[PDB]
Amino acid sequence: RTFSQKEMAFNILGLLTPEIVQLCQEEPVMADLNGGLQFIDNLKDFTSKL
């Protein structure tokens, strides 16, 4: 899937939650907000094809 600016902002603002804040305090947080794009083989070629 592909996000809107509002959706991405909601995701990051949730990443600014108190729970993720303390999580970052105790341990660096890697938040994959990619909408499943990592599972596409040859993303550049597929994008150019589309």
């Binding site: 108190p18 804040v21 305090q25 105790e26």
Partner: protein
Amino acid sequence: NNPNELTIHFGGAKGRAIRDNYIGMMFETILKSEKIFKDIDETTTSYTFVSPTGLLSATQFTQPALTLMEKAAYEDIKSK
């Protein structure tokens, strides 16, 4: 400095330990066990002390400061 305001922050492990100290502080009376800092809990990230003109006049900070100035003067006197 005698700051008018002073915010203690509870971020990181040291912050959690300090918050635990503040939470464990209890005002036992006759047996009731009301907490000194009722507004501090596990979900609080900070606590602010409030004074009208300066925190050095506050009882919690005045007493340690005065006890300590007297102790330090007496210990320098002892060293002499």
